[PDB]
Amino acid sequence: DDQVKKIDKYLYAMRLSDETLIDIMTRFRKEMKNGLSRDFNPTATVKMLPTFVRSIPDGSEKGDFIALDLGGSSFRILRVQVNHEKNQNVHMESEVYDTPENIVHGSGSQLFDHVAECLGDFMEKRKIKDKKLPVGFTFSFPCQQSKIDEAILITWTKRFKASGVEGADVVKLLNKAIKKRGDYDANIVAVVNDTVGTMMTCGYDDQHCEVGLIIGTGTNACYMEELRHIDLVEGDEGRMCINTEWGAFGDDGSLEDIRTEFDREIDRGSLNPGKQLFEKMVSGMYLGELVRLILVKMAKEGLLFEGRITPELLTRGKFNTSDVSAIEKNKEGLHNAKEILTRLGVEPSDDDCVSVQHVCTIVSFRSANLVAATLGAILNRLRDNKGTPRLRTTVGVDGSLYKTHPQYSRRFHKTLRRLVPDSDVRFLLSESGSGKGAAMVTAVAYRLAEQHRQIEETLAHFHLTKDMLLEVKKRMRAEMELGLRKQTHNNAVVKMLPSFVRRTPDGTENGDFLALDLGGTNFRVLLVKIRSGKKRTVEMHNKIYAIPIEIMQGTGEELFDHIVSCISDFLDYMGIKGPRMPLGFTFSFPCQQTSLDAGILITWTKGFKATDCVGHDVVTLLRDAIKRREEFDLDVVAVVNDTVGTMMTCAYEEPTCEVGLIVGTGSNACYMEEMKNVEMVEGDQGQMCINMEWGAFGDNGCLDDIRTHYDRLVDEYSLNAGKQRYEKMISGMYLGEIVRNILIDFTKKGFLFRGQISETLKTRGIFETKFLSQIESDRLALLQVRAILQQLGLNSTCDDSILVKTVCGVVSRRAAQLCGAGMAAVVDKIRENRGLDRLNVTVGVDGTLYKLHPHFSRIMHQTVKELSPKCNVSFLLSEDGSGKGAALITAVGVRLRTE
């Protein structure tokens, strides 16, 4: 009676009080909070790692998979076949492989070579190599993952200690070993921790399973947490399984006041000193030795075996946990203790057999008790989440010590139910192992992988290689030439139309002028005053005037009548209504010029479609409308394209600006060609500004090489089917449509919005330049993206938002590259013309897409630099619009008219 009370006095420390157990519980409860927080997670010892598993099996799972189970006490590989659809129910055949204390403690390479060899043999014995069966990986160690098929080892635990693995991705490490074998092909689709596998398994049979617990070589647990609580995972919808990794509870020294010298000594001799402390007082890997450490400490004080101490009772690991168990059996309890203590050399007194066996209870009871305190903190967290007052949940379990020890299970549940009363908990023991559960995870993981494979295959067509970009640059140049050569100009797609502007501002332009800006997003009328010499200055006023789309696609009569009306009102506005002022007309469309004041509208582009305009001279068309009104009189000195207007605006300040570019509703470019190359205009003196009209590039098929199904659909439904193919893969008026069309397709395939094509998604023009630009902002957050989308009328989840943003990126990126390859061709021609080996030139730019988009310009500039390394281009943005440049052209126009 005192012997018992004798040891209960010695091992007093290892006798935890309920109030104490509650304390620890409260402590872990706080460790969980810190672990899940984005602010404190970096310092927490309890990792609370996300698993990317959002629900237990639903029953829809089916297929043939292979599972690997490394990290437990046995390396086992299994094959799980499941398919209710047809009729088949869950079936699985497993095999166990040996793993010597050599591989486990060797180099990661040696370890993964073994795992790859064992999997090979397994597939051979079943001759299933030919099948690309999905592989699930149950790796019972702490792992960092940003996705289910990635697992970076944080640190080894238990018996493993292989070099070159920590901090690496075991998936990649394993994939290498297999590939190095060339024997077969693996498709590792997921990596799960055993606590998650165990939970998945028990969940299959009990749809109330919300916890996975393991108590074997090591101890850990996982539970279903609310996504809105997992800070380190963007989303607030539903739940995800968190792998607590509580074995490291108190590694920051939060359980020093509970750890004994026996614990510390056990640690100082461990493989991983300082870590997994909480686990070192529980798991069956340490129970035995923790006891043999006291037996020695007792004998060393004559309290046992008559103070005798054999070399065996001193040798490490000579007292297995197996002993600790057999010695606690109810039947042959003490009888067993005798045989054991006997082989230990020491002479077992039938009184010793009693003293010993009791020690075992104390140690083996502390474990069961501790685990009950932490698991209790988890159940309390679940109860808190549900809001309910009571709690009903199932808990999956597995692990030697639990599965094979006479009293553990028993005492464990007891203390538990005692600690958490307001809850009804069922403990289901995984009889099958992790295999079933891993397979259940692999099924869904794989389901999402094919979806992904398909999405990527499609998007891959929007990816151009540097080599593809050089071809486009090449083609651009070939077409540039066909258009300049009078013999081939007749059937060239890039018309290279001359503008009849032969020099950038000289600095003598002086006067007052009116200007028109038609073609972009805003039709506006301006008044510009230029003063040079001493006081060189420019003063301009403008006013925007709408233009109903009806008029825009009405008749040339109403269109130009409307324009003149606006010109009138502005003349009043500025007051200057009276004299005969010279006017520059910026008409952003392809015109055939004979002189600075004659433009035959070759064809309409963008969204304009007025009747009886194509084929006429726009100057005239305007002149007439003016005569008809009879309210004033003007001097139309010039007609100008916005690209040329832009170039002049920027060249007014920057003398090296010899290129103009526009990337807004439509896209076009212009530059200064050598008069000797412009075979369409007599002379070979000086230079001339060439309005390329490069939007038509590809209208002869030269781009059908990289155009996609979505590009064709967008073209096929445009106002000008067949024309302006290049500009239609670049400008803000079309980008959106390419996207919409890609989205509708993904939706029909059931990859977006639950497969529902909404009315909004069917509305053309829905994706404005302004939206494409917000959605791609880098300062944006997923929550915000989803918000924007919902505002548009699209009911999108967070997963949806991610895919939409991606799609927008692929499309917008390709647009910038194609545009860069185009500009690259231009600058390199200007360099070859000037026979240079290096050319410095700046480009004048304008266009809403260019100005608002967060990445277009950057990726564009980058691409030009990469395709034309012999030119140092600079892009200067026009902030005053074309107007300034139109007036600066009108000035010369007049100067040459007066002369």
Ligand X SMILES: O=P(O)(O)OC[C@H]1O[C@@H](O)[C@H](O)[C@@H](O)[C@@H]1O
Which residues belong to the annotated binding site for ATP? 15, 69-74, 330, 410-411, 517-522, 665, 732-733, 769-773, 848-852
DSSP state of 706: T
The answer to whether residue 588 forms part of the interface with ligand BGC (CB under 6 A) is yes
Catalytic residue among 588, 801, 812, 868: 588
Residue ranges for the known binding site are 15, 69-76, 140, 157-158, 193-194, 217, 220, 245, 276-279, 330, 398-400, 410-411, 434, 517-522, 588-589, 605-606, 641-642, 665, 667-668, 693, 727, 732-733, 769-773, 846-852, 882
What's the one-letter identity of residue 344? L
Conformation bin of residue 99: beta by default, left when phi > 0, alpha when psi is -120 to 50? beta
- Window of 46-54, 232-240, 531-539, 586-594 that interacts with ligand BGC by CB under 6 A: 586-594
The token pair at 312 is 């065996």
- Breaks in the chain after (C-N > 2.5 angstroms): none
Phi/psi at 90 (5° precision): -50, 120
Partner touching 678 among Ca ion, ligand X, ligand BGC, none, CB below 5 to 8 Å by kind: Ca ion
Known active-site residue 524: yes
Nearer to ligand BGC by Cβ, of 194 and 323: the residue is: 194
Catalytic residue from among 524, 707, 740, 786: 524
Tokens of 116: 């790859």
Contact 107/478 with Cβ under 8 angstroms? Answer: no
Task: Examine residue 829 and tell whether it contacts ligand BGC (CB under 6 A).
Answer: no
Which residues are bridge partners to 845 per DSSP? 661, 877
Q: How far is 258 from 572, CA to CA, in rounded Å? A: 91
Q: Which is nearer to ligand BGC, 243 or 863 (CB)?
A: 243
Q: Using the 8-state DSSP alphabet, how is residue 738 labeled?
A: H
Pull the structure tokens for residue 877.
Answer: 């943005």
β-bridge pairing 219-226 and 239-243: antiparallel
Question: Encoding tokens for residue 625?
Answer: 């409308």
Is 48 near Ca ion (CB under 5 A)?
no
Residues 223-282 touching Ca ion, rule: CB under 5 A, are: 230, 233
Residue with tokens 């916005």: 642
Query: Min. distance of Cβ 176 from ligand BGC in angstroms?
Result: 23
Residue 212 Cβ, how far from ligand BGC at the closest point, in Å? 9
d(CA 784, CA 775): 9
Of 635-643, 764-772, 812-820, 859-867, the window that binds ligand BGC (rule: CB under 6 A) is: 635-643
* Numbered residues of the known binding site for D-glucose 6-phosphate: 69-76, 194, 217, 398-400, 434, 517-521, 642, 665, 846-848, 882
For this structure, is 588 an active site residue? yes
DSSP-assigned letters across all residues of 137-179 = EEE-S-EE-SSTT--EE----TT---BT-TTSBHHHHHHHHHH
H or E element in which residue 539 lies: strand 537-545
Torsion of CA 517, 522, 523, 525, to 10 degrees: -70
- From the list Ca ion, ligand X, ligand BGC, none, partner contacted by residue 432 (C-beta under 5 to 8 A by kind): none
The two three-digit tokens of residue 854, written as one number: 């967060």
CB-count burial class (<10 Å; 0-12, 13-18, 19+) for 835: exposed
599 binds ligand BGC (CB under 6 A): no
Q: For residue 431, what are the contacts with CB-CB under 8 A and spacing of at least 6?
A: none
In contact, 81 and 64? CB cutoff 8 Å: yes
The counts of H helices and E strands in the chain are 27, 26
The span of 8-16, 137-145, 787-795, 828-836 binding ligand BGC (CB under 6 A) equals 137-145
CB atoms within 10 A of CB 755: 11
The Cα 332–Cα 340 span in angstroms is 12
Do the beta carbons of residue 409 and residue 395 sit within 8 Å?
A: no
678 is an interface residue for Ca ion by CB under 5 A? yes
Output the CA angle 887-892-897, nearest 5 degrees. Answer: 120
Out of ligand X, Ca ion, ligand BGC, none, what residue 142 binds, judged by CB under 5 to 8 A for its kind, is ligand BGC
User: Which one, 194 or 352, has the nearer CB to ligand X?
Assistant: 194
Distance CA 22, CA 377 (A): 9
Determine the Cα–Cα distance for residues 199 and 112; give it in Å rounded to an integer. 26
Q: Which is nearer to ligand X, 135 or 702 (CB)?
A: 135
Angstrom CA distances, 742 to 56, 706, 800, 818, stand at 33, 16, 13, 19
Judged by DSSP in three states, 420 sits in: coil
Region of 576 please: left (phi>0), alpha (psi -120 to 50) or beta: alpha
589 is a site residue for ligand BGC (CB under 6 A) = yes
> Does 582 contact ligand BGC by CB under 6 A?
no
Binding region for ligand X (CB under 6 A): 69, 71-73, 138, 140, 194, 197, 214, 216-217, 398-400, 433-434, 517, 519-521, 586, 588, 642, 645, 662, 664-665, 846-848, 881-882
> In this chain, which of 103, 104, 123, 214 binds ligand BGC, going by CB under 6 A?
214
**Residue 194 or 693 with smaller CB distance to ligand X:** 194
Nearer to ligand BGC, 303 or 670 (CB): 670
H runs (alpha helix) in 433-495 = 435-459, 466-484
Residue 813 annotated to the active site: no
Taking CB under 6 A as the criterion, the residue among 605, 741, 842, 857 binding ligand BGC is: 605
Candidate segments 58-66, 191-199, 311-319, 764-772, binder of ligand BGC by CB under 6 A? 191-199
> Residue 641, interface with ligand BGC (CB under 6 A)?
yes
In the annotated binding site for D-glucose, the residues are: 140, 157-158, 193-194, 220, 245, 276-279, 588-589, 605-606, 641-642, 667-668, 693, 727
245 binds, among ligand X, Ca ion, ligand BGC, none (CB under 5 to 8 A by kind): ligand BGC
- Measured from the CB atom, the residue of 77 and 492 that comes closer to ligand X is 77
Of residues 617, 642, 715, 880, which has the active-site annotation? 642
Note whether 693 binds ligand BGC by CB under 6 A: yes
CB of 314 to ligand X, least distance (A): 27
Stretch that binds Ca ion, among 363-371, 673-681, 782-790, 840-848 (CB under 5 A): 673-681
Q: Which residue is nearest to Ca ion (CB)?
A: 678
DSSP conformation class of 523? E
Angle, in degrees to the nearest 10, between helices 170-179 and 108-125: 60
Q: Does 666 bind ligand BGC (CB under 6 A)?
A: yes
Residues at the site binding ligand BGC, with contacts judged by CB under 6 A:
71-72, 140-142, 157-158, 193-195, 214, 218, 220, 245, 247, 279, 519-520, 588-590, 605-606, 641-643, 662, 665-666, 668, 693, 695, 727
Residues at the site binding Ca ion, with contacts judged by CB under 5 A:
230, 233, 678
Catalytic sites, residue numbers: 524, 588, 642
